[PDB]
Amino acid sequence: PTVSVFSMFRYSNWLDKLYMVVGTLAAIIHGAGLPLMMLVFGEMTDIFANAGNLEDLMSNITNRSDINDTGFFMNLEEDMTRYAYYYSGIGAGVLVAAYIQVSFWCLAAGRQIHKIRKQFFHAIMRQEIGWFDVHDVGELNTRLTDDVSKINEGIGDKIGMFFQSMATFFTGFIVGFTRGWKLTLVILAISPVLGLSAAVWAKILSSFTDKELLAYAKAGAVAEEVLAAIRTVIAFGGQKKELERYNKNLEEAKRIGIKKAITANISIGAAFLLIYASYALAFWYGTTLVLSGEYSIGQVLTVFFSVLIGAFSVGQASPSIEAFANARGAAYEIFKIIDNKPSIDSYSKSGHKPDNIKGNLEFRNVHFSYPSRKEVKILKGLNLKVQSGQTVALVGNSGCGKSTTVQLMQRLYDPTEGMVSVDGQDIRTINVRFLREIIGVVSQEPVLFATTIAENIRYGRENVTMDEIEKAVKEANAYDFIMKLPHKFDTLVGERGAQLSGGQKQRIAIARALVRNPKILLLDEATSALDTESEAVVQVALDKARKGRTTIVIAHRLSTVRNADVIAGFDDGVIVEKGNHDELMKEKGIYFKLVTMQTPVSFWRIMKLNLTEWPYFVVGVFCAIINGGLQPAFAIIFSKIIGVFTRIDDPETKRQNSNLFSLLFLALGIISFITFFLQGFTFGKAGEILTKRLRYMVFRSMLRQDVSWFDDPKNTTGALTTRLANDAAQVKGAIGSRLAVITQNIANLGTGIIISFIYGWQLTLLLLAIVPIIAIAGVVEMKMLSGQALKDKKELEGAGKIATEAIENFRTVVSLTQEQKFEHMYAQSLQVPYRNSLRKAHIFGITFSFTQAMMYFSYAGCFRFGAYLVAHKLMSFEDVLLVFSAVVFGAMAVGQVSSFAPDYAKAKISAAHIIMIIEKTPLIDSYSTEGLMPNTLEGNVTFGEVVFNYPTRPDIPVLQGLSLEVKKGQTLALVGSSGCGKSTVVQLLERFYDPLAGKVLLDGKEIKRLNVQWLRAHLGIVSQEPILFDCSIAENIAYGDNSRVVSQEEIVRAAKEANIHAFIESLPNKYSTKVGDKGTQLSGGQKQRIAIARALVRQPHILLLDEATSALDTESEKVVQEALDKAREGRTCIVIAHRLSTIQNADLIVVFQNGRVKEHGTHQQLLAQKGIYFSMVSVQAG
Amino acid sequence: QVVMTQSPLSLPVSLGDQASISCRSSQSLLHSNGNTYLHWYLQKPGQSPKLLIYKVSNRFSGVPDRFSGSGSGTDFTLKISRVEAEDLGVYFCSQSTHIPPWTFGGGTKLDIKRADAAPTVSIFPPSSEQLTSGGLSVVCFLNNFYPKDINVKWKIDGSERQNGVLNSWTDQDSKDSTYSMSSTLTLTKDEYERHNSYTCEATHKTSTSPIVKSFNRNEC
Amino acid sequence: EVQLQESGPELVKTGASVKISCKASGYSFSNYYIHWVKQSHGKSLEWIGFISCYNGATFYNQKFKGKATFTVDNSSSTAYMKFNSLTFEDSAVYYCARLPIQFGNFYPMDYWGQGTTVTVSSAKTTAPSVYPLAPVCGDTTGSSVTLGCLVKGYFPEPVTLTWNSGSLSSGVHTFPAVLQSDLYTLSSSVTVTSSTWPSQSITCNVAHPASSTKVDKKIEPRGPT
Ligand SMILES: CC(=O)O[C@H]1C(=O)[C@@]2(C)[C@H]([C@H](OC(=O)c3ccccc3)[C@]3(O)C[C@H](OC(=O)[C@H](O)[C@@H](NC(=O)c4ccccc4)c4ccccc4)C(C)=C1C3(C)C)[C@]1(OC(C)=O)CO[C@@H]1C[C@@H]2O
Ligand SMILES: CC(C)CCC[C@@H](C)[C@H]1CC[C@H]2[C@@H]3CC=C4C[C@@H](O)CC[C@]4(C)[C@H]3CC[C@]12C
Ligand SMILES: CC(C)CCC[C@@H](C)[C@H]1CC[C@H]2[C@@H]3CC=C4C[C@@H](O)CC[C@]4(C)[C@H]3CC[C@]12C
Ligand SMILES: CC(C)CCC[C@@H](C)[C@H]1CC[C@H]2[C@@H]3CC=C4C[C@@H](O)CC[C@]4(C)[C@H]3CC[C@]12C
Ligand SMILES: CC(C)CCC[C@@H](C)[C@H]1CC[C@H]2[C@@H]3CC=C4C[C@@H](O)CC[C@]4(C)[C@H]3CC[C@]12C
Ligand SMILES: CC(C)CCC[C@@H](C)[C@H]1CC[C@H]2[C@@H]3CC=C4C[C@@H](O)CC[C@]4(C)[C@H]3CC[C@]12C
Ligand SMILES: CC(C)CCC[C@@H](C)[C@H]1CC[C@H]2[C@@H]3CC=C4C[C@@H](O)CC[C@]4(C)[C@H]3CC[C@]12C
Ligand SMILES: CC(C)CCC[C@@H](C)[C@H]1CC[C@H]2[C@@H]3CC=C4C[C@@H](O)CC[C@]4(C)[C@H]3CC[C@]12C
Ligand SMILES: CC(C)CCC[C@@H](C)[C@H]1CC[C@H]2[C@@H]3CC=C4C[C@@H](O)CC[C@]4(C)[C@H]3CC[C@]12C
Ligand SMILES: *[C@@H]1O[C@H](CO)[C@@H](O)[C@H](O)[C@H]1NC(C)=O
Ligand SMILES: *[C@@H]1O[C@H](CO)[C@@H](O)[C@H](O)[C@H]1NC(C)=O
């Protein structure tokens, strides 16, 4: 699961091997630049302290004219110029070193990740169909996104900051042992707890978001399950139970979040307590050593400061090890993909290529099974020999594998037994790509790339001019719809052929295959949705180009099969019947039976959502008022310690003031712990119950909505669970964290500036000039430490959706062998974010080094002006130290706090969208009782002139004014083509869509005036695909009846009536057996039977069936239908199915054609007048 | 400038009792704090002056428990209780709390406090060798006396001589605990033969009659 | 262990320039001041000045501004005082003492050097004039008799006067050397009984090293002359 670190950096140039070495040398040199500034700070404060001690003695005596005072402070004013030169030198060196190290590591990352990305896509276009069938399609795309982002975050910049932190730690210890070791051993005795506190501080500062998603992991399943099955759920009326289950999950999630917030804030409070207790110990022992007359004050400042910076930087080194371990663990998979090579190399030019390509097909003893399900053997040997120009058709029921034979032809796989050959030699020694280009194949359901149609028809082969394009499309007879639409070669077809119709799509797909000019043509169901005349002209064109080529046609319509060369028949995988038309006529087999039968708006109204919980906000604002003013208190106490140690006094007065301030540090630590814990707890509680109540109300206002609001292209299931998962937790940052951060920063900086203006005026004005660049020096470094920006990966994947539409449409391009064109398209689509990445890699280094140098230059300028002010006697050294300490440390605290907060602008926009969802009222209300409530009914339905257009497809009408008359107990079958408005009449009944025109009378009562929930209560259906919920089977069937005490005798009675009682009573924990998502554990016929049992508990007066025997056994269809036939009396029953067994015994039968009712009446009347329903009956009987 | 005035310049303590030395300022040595600074040092013969008491009540570290300071205002005192044989040597008293004259004190020796005695005055005329070389040096020795305050008068022909007299006092003897001194009168050769009577008079406090010793040039 | 130690004695000429050195050992040299004080012969101590011993900022008393100069040396951690234009009034014993820079003037000068001794003179190296003295002729008042020779005019110190090569320490007093017109004088005396003298031999043995002169004088009685 992990790679070694030697193999991790293997795709690198000499230039990146130089970039990494120079960017770690400059990282060490930049890392050794803070303790070297502590040396200068110690020696400068020692100069200031020694001049000051000397000064008092001269003062009482007086009478010394001017030179004596001059010379005493002129030595100070002269020596501070040399120390300002030292500071400026360290500042310039740190500027150059930090720019070089950041820029060179980010350039090494950019070049390496570009080569990784190109090699991974080039390897994934060598990987067979079988690997796609075993692994995934969507997890592959998230593997690309996640693994590239994790490599870029792993070897990107964190390897530089790790070496910088190691250099800072080692330089700090070397300085702390070379100045004074007796203090460094005390702080080294402390320093494990210091490093542990810093490590856990950076740890819980790093993640900050994963606990919310692992708390919502248990509740989002119910969300995605209900939003996936929205129409069936509001068709049953089970809003209330799923609402209560969502509540039961959210209470647990909120309680674990409460525990998380309390524990994290206690941890950071204990971190602050340990920092200030380390100050109290360090300065108590330091002033013991100074008043002993053994150290100076500058020696104590240098050793302690140098030691503490080293310990916290080696603590802050901790996230880089985690990021690098994650990069190794994410790199192993991409290295596994780019390592392994298949047996069938689709780019090896060591394949063999024929020249005299003559059409001849040889199959002998061909056994093959799918590697997805290898336990089942579909094929048990097929032997064929097809000559040139021989139109071979294959007939049989669905399940024998005509599509299997087509996929076996193009070498998408290999047969486990035997040997296949094309014109003498076998496929197993000759080239795959040259063979793949010469076999033009149309599959069953083609896919069309969403480019212009000229490029689509160009996609067969490289150099095709428009004259061959026009000849091919006129052969395809697909020029009329080209002529009527604008942009006749410039029309961008939408996603998956949604812009055009199906017949135009299949005709231009035939064109797209014919532009290759192939040697063998293979059609698979080429006229599924096509009409009469266009299939006729397509088949005439197919016979126009069949004389030089070998052809195999698979189709259901026998109009295009009767004019073929050889007809054959599959049975159990084995080709059983052979010969021409009349040979199978006199053979009297299954084909004889077949032919015998056939003849923004929110502006701080986000506080309105949380006006109810005022006391949490009151104690939070109070604790932020206190906890903002703990940097100026630290400025006061630190400045007063050094102001004690500049002037002369008694030894006992110095010891008293030193002990008092080394106690005031510890008092500040305890107050910091208490107020920080209390603020963090109360803002955690307010934000958490805001997230809980807003998730509840957003879920309920989602569930009140119409079906037609859920079919919107902007309102998808993924977008709604994003608006419930990601954006519900983003509304706490617009109010609670915003008030905490604004109040904390005001009491951090305003009182520091006011104290500074009272004590020293001129220096406060100069520092107010230089202050915003130090604040930006806080925020930019804190943004670099923990996730600066993630828009570049979004731009990357938005340009790289070519990869997604290449992987999703892999089934066409493995036939077209057009891999190299897609690889070069990806290589030329990566090129612009490459330049954007290099531009960002220079600009970020420039601005980071500008702020990092402006810190040291602020030190130099502030202390030179303070030296002048002390020398001309307008303030003291205690006051310049107070002004500088308060303003600069307040600015860095403002940066470090205001970078920790989440953003406010996107939080405000997300709150505006959540308020948009909350405020909206649907056109119908499921909770209202108003309408027509009659006490009685009969059960007669009358449709008249009903037209319906889909709201997502307003230009395409699926209905053209149907009408229907249903009476009591009338088994009404609805037969038609796939996609002619079969479930549309169900959706018109169940109050999903209300039609724009038409009239529907339910027993002389119009449905538009009735109660909405009453119609949804009385009837009960079975879905087109059975969906169950994440519980047991007792709660699967128990969902059928709601607002009612569900009796278990009805449960076992319905399980016996649906003949699912056996499969339930066989299972261990029989009525408590936990079923996963959508019934993925148990089989399809069993969940179809439990869907029958779930509809059966409703006892509906109106019953609808939509494909009641899609996947079900022949003995199970009778035991399903016996309960139906004993219970079809009393209730109106309407069954829609493709199997004719429930259609023969039906009462009245209605055939549809493009939405229009063609034939209606009794079954014998439709069997008398031979129309289209006779051809529907003529399928497989006899 | 303040001027400390250490009140005894000798202090004849015995061996094994109490002794008191008294520093006395010329201005109130009370600072603007509540503290009064004057420090008491011992100085041995020929070695470095160690520190004994600082900030008159307190005590340094390493010094034994006999020494104790007291007093305030402009009157300060060190007291040695149970004086050993090791605490002999001068004792002075820093400082002024008004600096930078930063003044100091006189000093106070300590003695062994003998019973009194009388000096054995001897006289010696200039010998033949310096009378050959042209000069008189007549000397008066006086040995084995206590205490160390004696006045010697060189009377020539009944008149005092306070010119050309040199006096040298030895230190206190170790074994005998007494003193001695020598007086040398140096004049020329020809001034010797102008006067006959030379007397050396010793006026000690333990003799009401000053001990005279005399000689004449001509008689031998 | 905190120890400031100084150079040995000097024997300079008038108008010359001399440099004396206080070397500090056992403590952190860069904090404490170094105060130089001066004790004459038989007077109160007198404060000359102080040197800051971190950067080198001096401060002198007003009597001594211009005729003294303080330097420091941080590498070997010493402090030097240089006298220029010496007169006779600058012949004394000089001490160095430290004082901490943090609580300066509110702390005593806690550690002192042993003090060097500067002896300004002008004359030249000179042989001593040894004269023996004899008791006044005529009467003897008892058994005790006192003798003793004097040494005049010599330069420089010291003179190891020694009675009978050290075979007599039963009355030998040696009075310290006095100054008279930049020349020295040292006397001595012995008290012996009436039995040895003048019946035995007793001699002064003056041994001046600075001219290597060894003089022996036999003390004889003054008879009738
Ligand atoms: C609680 C407390 O009072 O002590 C803290 C601390 O937060 C303070 C004092 C720090 C601290 O810095 C100093 O006190 C300091 C003193 C003399 C000379 C130079 C620095 C701190 O070093 C900074 C360190 O914070 C960081 O993690 C910084 O990001 C960073 N140090 C920097 O100051 C810095 C900022 C920008 C660019 C380069 C450096 C840091 C990163 C890794 C390891 C150590 C420091 C911490 C929590 C402390 C200390 C240790 C005192 C400051 O930094 C920030 C951004 O918080 C500097 O001004 C703020 C004021 C803060 O209160
Ligand atoms: C342009 C941005 C990066 C700011 C660059 C900072 C430079 C211009 C600043 C920072 C430190 C400053 C120096 C600090 C000290 C002094 C000593 C003074 O006696 C002369 C001016 C001088 C020499 C300053 C000149 C200007 C200076 C070098
Ligand atoms: C690689 C070179 C060109 C970069 C120059 C960086 C300079 C500005 C840095 C690096 C080494 C630093 C010096 C390292 C040691 C000390 C000793 C200390 O008692 C005085 C400051 C002093 C002298 C530092 C001053 C600033 C300094 C000279
Ligand atoms: C090894 C583990 C326990 C951590 C390291 C602790 C050791 C090395 C450190 C921590 C505190 C340090 C002590 C702190 C104080 C001083 C006083 C000094 O006058 C002698 C050294 C001495 C006594 C140190 C000896 C070394 C010491 C004991
Ligand atoms: C009220 C809000 C707006 C700001 C709060 C600032 C508070 C926390 C700050 C500002 C003034 C500071 C006080 C100013 C003076 C001193 C005297 C010192 O010997 C002890 C600390 C002490 C007492 C400070 C403690 C903290 C302090 C009271
Ligand atoms: C004299 C007194 C009134 C001066 C008060 C200082 C004021 C003007 C300064 C100091 C602290 C500053 C705040 C610090 C932090 C932020 C967070 C940022 O996201 C919005 C601006 C905001 C809120 C600043 C606004 C201006 C501010 C409040
Ligand atoms: C953005 C604001 C805070 C910055 C204003 C510009 C600053 C850099 C300029 C404009 C006015 C200037 C001040 C004008 C007057 C003086 C008085 C002089 O005796 C000390 C310098 C001092 C105090 C100047 C310091 C720098 C200064 C404050
Ligand atoms: C101009 C005079 C009158 C007032 C100056 C007030 C200063 C202290 C205020 C005003 C503008 C404020 C800045 C405004 C914007 C932000 C961006 C934020 O991400 C970090 C803090 C930061 C950088 C603020 C720091 C403090 C700040 C610079
Ligand atoms: C970007 C910032 C940090 C650069 C440093 C600020 C510069 C412009 C300021 C800060 C302190 C200022 C110095 C303060 C003191 C004096 C002494 C005066 O007699 C000459 C000007 C001089 C030498 C100023 C020059 C300009 C100066 C160095
Ligand atoms: C100040 O005092 C001193 C002595 O008290 C004196 O020399 C000086 O003239 C006085 N005046 C000035 C301007 O220094
Ligand atoms: C200090 O003041 C005195 C006058 O009292 C003057 O002579 C001297 O030059 C001044 N400077 C120094 C360094 O002594």
Explain this structure.
By secondary structure, chain A is an alpha/beta fold. Chain A folds into three domains: 5-338 and 608-916, ABC transporter transmembrane region fold, CATH 1.20.1560; 347-393 and 400-438 and 557-599, Rossmann fold (3-Layer(aba) Sandwich), CATH 3.40.50; 937-1019 and 1147-1182, Rossmann fold, CATH 3.40.50.300. Chain A is 60% helix and 8% strand. A six-stranded mixed sheet of chain A has the order 5-6-7-3-8-9, sandwiched between helices. A six-stranded mixed sheet of chain A has the order 15-16-17-12-18-19. With 220 residues, chain B is mainly beta. Chain B has two domains: 1-114, Immunoglobulins (Immunoglobulin-like, Sandwich); 116-215, Immunoglobulins (Immunoglobulin-like, Sandwich). Helices cover 2% and strands 37% of the residues of chain B. Chain B has one helix and 14 strands. Chain B has one helix at residues 128-132; strands spanning 19-23, 40-43, 50-53, 67-72, 75-80, 90-93, 120-124, 136-145, 150-156, 159-161, 165-169, 179-187, 197-204, 211-216. In chain B, strand 9 and strand 10 (159-161) form a beta hairpin. The longest helix of chain B has 5 residues, at 128-132. Chain B is elongated and about 75 Å long. The termini of chain B are far apart. Chain C is mainly beta. In chain C, strand 3 (33-39) and strand 4 (46-51) form a beta hairpin. Chain C is built from no helices and 17 strands. Chain C folds into two domains: 1-122, no CATH class; 123-221, Immunoglobulins (Immunoglobulin-like). Chain C is elongated. Chains in contact: A-B, A-C, B-C. Chains B and C meet through strand 7, strand 8, strand 11 and strand 12 of B and strand 10, strand 11, strand 13 and strand 15 of C. One 2-acetamido-2-deoxy-beta-D-glucopyranose is lined by residues 64-65, 67-68, 71 of chain A. It is classed as membrane protein. The entry lists the keywords abcb1, p-glycoprotein, p-gp, ABC transporter, membrane protein.
